[PDB]
């Protein structure tokens, strides 16, 4: 339901189909930055072949997908390219409509606040304006589709695309206010990747902000709605878990998926901070770092909640970024999900401290990942230290980019209250 969004979709699917049918598809699928042990098409096909052989897919160290993935790609094993085109299109559509509604809500709040005049007089080119927000949903869909990260994730046929679609539909349903569908999609995403659980905090907040329920201790309605939403979420999660048990009639997906995400036993190189750290780790003293590095992903959810209580969508963006950066086995398609949210926050492009250098660092790291990977895997010229340094630089760039956006947002809020 848009004039240029359809054109964006057709260009995206054209690019993706050309890459699928090109000779780079196999190379992209074997790329280790776009493919993790949790999001590998080769591993999905391997699990299906194990089922054909009659051996359980989780009686091994190669298959770590969920039973819903098994069920879905049992039927869509032949149409996989079309399925991945469809799921990226669905992610783009969900982001488009979610951001459209969010911009409408933001302009409504800005109008209702300018009416009672809580802004300083020295604020003219600092308020969101309808002509500058007209194409923000289109730019969100454009960043989601026409960036190399999502294109590579689709061509590699990574299930991180499915995870992105689930998270985007969670965002869309939370923004539209459907608490039940919000809980269903959040449960599906948590069941898939185990790190949308933190996203439970922003969504609820936004839901409350959409119901005009005060978020405060001495408020019965807030606790009622929080309990209702939490029960919907946990019940959906447990129902999906029991159903996934019934698919194989065994609780083997539980260790092989969630304990694999939490304990990190594979050490396959990623763009993340876990693989080399846990490859070169002391035997004793290693469980402490597993614990702290897993607590890292869930650590900022509460402080960012109590600092961004009135801004649950920026809080949701920051949480998605934190999940993408700190994560066992992150693919670069997880980076794409939060990078698609940049046009939502491009009005902060006057308080961003250092955007140019950080964008340069991220681009250089992205184009150095395959190069140095070739130089220490296929060429013996380099070693694992090169790839480790590039992962460090990429992740530092991501941290500083997210911190710059968060700082710019806070500075814009302060300037909204206090004159510049």
């Amino acid at each position: 339901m848009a004039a240029p969004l359809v054109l964006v979709l057709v260009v995206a699917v054209t690019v993706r189909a050309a890459l699928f049918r090109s000779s780079l598809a196999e190379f992209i699928s074997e790329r280790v930055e776009v493919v993790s042990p949790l999001s590998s098409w080769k591993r999905v096909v391997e699990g299906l072949s194990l089922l054909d052989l009659g051996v359980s897919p989780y009686s091994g160290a190669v298959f770590h997908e969920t039973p819903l993935i098994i069920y879905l790609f049992h039927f869509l094993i032949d149409y996989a390219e079309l399925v991945f085109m469809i799921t990226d299109a669905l992610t783009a559509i969900a982001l488009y409509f979610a951001i459209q509604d969010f911009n409408k809500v933001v302009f409504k709040k800005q109008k209702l606040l300018l009416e009672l005049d809580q802004y300083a007089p020295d604020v003219a080119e600092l308020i969101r304006t309808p002509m500058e927000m007209r194409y923000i949903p289109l730019k969100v869909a454009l960043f989601y589709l026409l960036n190399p990260y999502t294109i590579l994730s689709c061509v590699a046929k990574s299930t991180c695309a499915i995870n992105n679609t689930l998270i985007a539909f969670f965002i869309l349903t939370t923004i539209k206010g459907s608490a039940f569908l919000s809980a269903i999609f959040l449960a599906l995403a948590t069941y898939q990747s185990l790190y949308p659980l933190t996203l439970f905090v922003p969504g609820l907040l936004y839901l409350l902000q959409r119901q005009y329920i005060p978020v405060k201790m001495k408020s019965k309605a807030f606790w009622i709605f929080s309990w209702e939403y939490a029960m919907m979420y946990v019940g959906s999660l447990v129902v999906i878990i029991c159903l996934s048990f019934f698919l194989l009639s065994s609780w083997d997906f539980i260790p092989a998926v969630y304990g694999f995400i939490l304990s990190v036993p594979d050490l396959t190189p990623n763009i993340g901070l876990f693989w080399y750290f846990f490859a070169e780790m002391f035997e004793h003293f290693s469980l402490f770092f597993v614990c702290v590095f897993q607590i890292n992903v869930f650590f900022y959810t509460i402080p960012l909640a109590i600092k961004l209580k009135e801004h649950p969508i920026f809080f949701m963006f920051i949480q998605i970024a934190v999940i993408a950066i700190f994560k066992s086995y992150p693919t670069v398609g997880d980076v794409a999900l939060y990078m698609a949210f940049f046009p939502v926050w491009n009005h902060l492009y006057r308080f961003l401290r250092n955007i140019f250098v950080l964008t340069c660092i991220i681009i250089v790291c992205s184009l150095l990942f395959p190069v140095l990977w070739h130089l220490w895997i296929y060429a013996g010229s380099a070693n694992s230290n090169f790839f480790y340094a590039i992962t460090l630089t990429f992740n530092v760039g991501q941290i500083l980019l997210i911190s710059d956006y968060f700082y710019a947002f806070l500075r814009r809020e302060y300037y909204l209250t206090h004159g510049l």
């Binding site: 080769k42 052989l53 051996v55 009686s59």
Partner: protein
Amino acid sequence: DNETLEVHPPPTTTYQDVILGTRKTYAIYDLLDTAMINNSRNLNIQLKWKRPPENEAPPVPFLHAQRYVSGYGLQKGELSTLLYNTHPYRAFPVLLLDTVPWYLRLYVHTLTITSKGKENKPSYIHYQPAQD
């Protein structure tokens, strides 16, 4: 069919039998024979043998294998084992057992058995995967 190999010490006797596939014959030296080996008649069996001309050797033993690793980088490769049936009259069943030490993560959906350029589905397939 005659003209066996020349062994210098005259052997005790000759034992002709079908040993593996072919009717091959042996010269026997019975060490528990004081005629063959006295207290001062140490036995040094001599055998005249050199690589026979190619028109005088057995062809090939109807079955041999050759395993090797495909690919050239790290992170990926193929365990491929050619196995030959040089009998031009008889198919025979062969039981192949492979043990791979769980740091070469095998992808069993990539298991191909061509055997003619066509695809040969194994009669019996068993695969236990590896736990790290």
